[PDB]
């Protein structure tokens, strides 16, 4: 019949809970506000914006009733503060973190700063949530940890070596996740994302994801550049899967616990195949581009091929991505039209 | 004929090179200076006194000659700030890393105050070795990575599950090592260091190690405590073998670089054993004790059986230590009974 998540989704609005959004203002974060607020949840907020933005908070308030929006407190803190942590988890049910520092890139050139956030600030939430006595703990981990392992597809109990100091910071998400449970008790599920997109993520900065780079990129007419040979291959994940996963983590049952999984949709994209699929999308909503891609050298510490198993967020979450990535781009290039019209 | 070490006590002198310690004021960190100082090197000491001590500065300054002492060039400051580090490795040739909040027990009151120290403060140290250039970089790693893995001896390449907070901080480091050369072309060595003992590692505060421990409190008449059966075995490693490993790893060919190693000695030696190797060591001194050990429960986060298998760093190290747990204990047993008195 249906499925767990729509069902969860019946169930929610009718006992309304309590939850915890670090990073909120951000792409997934400011995803799963949209969300939560239209299924009646009291939702609590915190981010710095560092690389969050207030036009992603008042573009959800666009999107959701009145009386939804009334069910949202921001805080704007920093992760890496105990006292905003303490504050943003008290009186919370589910805290799903997303509050971190992306982008591979960035954390070769800052490594330092990546690691404040990511790592200090994790521990930060870890113990704050503890504290709090929430109900689940649900943090955003990385398909980068499974680094230089050649194999395909992804299973979450054989990773490879971290191939940057990002994806050293999302490792030890898990592993500090796993040393509370056995140390105090406190269970958590970490979500290993794979190159997620949708509304909202980033188009502008040095370090854009490839999706919101490359779209925005020929609705310029700008030269769209492809690192390596194109070959490179990705799980892209449209934020509505990834959203699914999140609040079924948040409400898992005891066995799903202590547990990471990988979050995707189990496709493989080239972004050969990427830098045609966003063009022909573009190109059905009235956006021509010509230009070939102009393609450079690989980037440093990324990653070959990335393809997910889904089947163990299957079996025990209960999980079903409904979104392909063609559907995703539908969805998602419309959005990138207008915030650049 | 001599060993690698001992040839390596030989060249030193007639061509000194510029060390750095951070951690200097403490345990294993006084102890290289002492060995340093000895072989006519310079030295460069960094160090806050978090769980350090003036004194232990003041006792290597009464073992070393007056010229010697003034190779020496000492730096109140924190491996936290990024400035503290560029200044300690300004012109610095190797650097030997021990700066860092040891104890499991005190890891899991507070894992926030040993991540900040041992996860932030290594990656400071780490850039700030890579932008001076120095030519070497080692750092203190732990057994303790080897986790719930029951298998023994313990191997580098196969580890478990870290059991507590301090056991991910320090495995950690070697996973930024392993980035940091991956990335920027920066080798090191981590050295995973084995229950070190010996003089100068501090028998007060409620973190005290096993050995100074009980040494004190039958000096002092006390009861001496025994976390679960005393079955539990460790790889005493006594001071000077980690010494030599330390100044080995520093001076080691481009083949030994960007690996770690195990340092102990391969002894199994159980708590049980320990009590009486103690007790005896001192009676052996004129310090009698006739009290039994006083069982209670196992402590959290401790690790069953520790025992090393130093193959990897006799073949590539040529690491050869000299020093039992008995020869060890003869040694340190003086230094404690002249300390309480
Ligand atoms: N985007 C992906 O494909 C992907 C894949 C795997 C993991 N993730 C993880 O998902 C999370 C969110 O990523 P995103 O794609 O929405 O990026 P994003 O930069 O749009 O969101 C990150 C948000 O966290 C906030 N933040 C950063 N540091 C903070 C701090 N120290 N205190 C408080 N707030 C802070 C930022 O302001 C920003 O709003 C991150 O943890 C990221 O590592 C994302
Ligand atoms: N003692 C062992 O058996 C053992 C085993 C494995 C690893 N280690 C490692 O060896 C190193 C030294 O341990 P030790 O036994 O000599 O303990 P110790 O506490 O006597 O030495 C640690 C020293 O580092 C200093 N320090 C701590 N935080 C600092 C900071 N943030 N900035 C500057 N200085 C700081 C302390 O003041 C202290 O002098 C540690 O890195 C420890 O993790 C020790
Ligand atoms: C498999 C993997 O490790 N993915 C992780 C990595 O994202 P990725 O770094 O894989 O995502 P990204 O969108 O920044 O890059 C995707 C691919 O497109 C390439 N590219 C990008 C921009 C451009 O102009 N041209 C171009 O060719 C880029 O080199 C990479 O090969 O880090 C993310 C956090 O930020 C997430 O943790 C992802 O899970
Ligand atoms: C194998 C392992 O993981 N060892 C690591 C761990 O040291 P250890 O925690 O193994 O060293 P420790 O000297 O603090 O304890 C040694 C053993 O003696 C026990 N004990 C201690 C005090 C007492 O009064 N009674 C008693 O029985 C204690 O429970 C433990 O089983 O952490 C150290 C940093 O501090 C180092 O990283 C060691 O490599």
Not at 45 to 59: I, K, P, S, V, Y
Request: proline fraction near 4%; charged fraction near 20%; include cysteine.
């Amino acid at each position: 019949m249906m499925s767990r998540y729509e069902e969860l989704r019946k169930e929610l609005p009718a006992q309304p809970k309590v939850w915890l959004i670090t990073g909120v203002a951000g792409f997934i974060g400011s995803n799963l506000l949209e969300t939560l607020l239209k299924l009646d949840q009291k939702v609590v907020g915190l981010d710095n914006f560092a690389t969050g933005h207030q036009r992603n908070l008042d573009e959800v308030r666009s999107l959701v009733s009145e009386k939804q929006w009334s069910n949202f407190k921001f805080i704007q803190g920093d992760i890496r503060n105990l006292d905003d942590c303490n504050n943003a988890c008290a009186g919370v049910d589910y805290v799903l973190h997303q509050a971190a520092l992306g982008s591979v890139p960035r954390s070769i050139n800052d490594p330092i700063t990546s690691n404040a956030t990511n790592i200090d600030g994790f521990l930060n939430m870890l113990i704050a949530a503890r504290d709090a006595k929430v109900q689940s703990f649900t943090y955003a981990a990385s398909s980068s940890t499974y680094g230089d392992h050649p194999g395909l597809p992804k299973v979450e109990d054989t990773i490879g070596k971290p191939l940057s100091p990002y994806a050293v910071t999302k490792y030890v998400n898990e592993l500090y996740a796993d040393v509370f449970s056995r140390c105090y008790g406190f269970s958590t599920i970490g979500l290993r994302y794979f190159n997620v997109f949708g509304r909202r993520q980033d188009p502008n900065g040095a370090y854009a994801a490839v999706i919101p780079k490359w779209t925005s990129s020929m609705i310029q007419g700008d030269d769209v550049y492809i690192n390596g040979d194109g070959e490179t291959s990705r799980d892209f994940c449209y934020i509505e899967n990834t959203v699914q996963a999140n609040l079924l983590a948040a409400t898992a049952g005891l066995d799903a616990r202590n547990q990471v999984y990988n979050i995707a949709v189990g496709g493989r994209t080239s972004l050969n195949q990427l830098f045609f699929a966003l063009r022909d999308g573009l190109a059905e909503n009235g956006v021509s581009y010509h230009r070939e891609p102009v393609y450079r050298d690989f980037r440093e510490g990324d990653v070959r091929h990335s393809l997910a198993d889904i089947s163990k967020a299957a079996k025990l979450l209960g999980y079903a991505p409904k979104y392909d990535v063609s559907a995703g781009v539908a969805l998602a290039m419309p959005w990138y039209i207008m915030f650049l019209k």
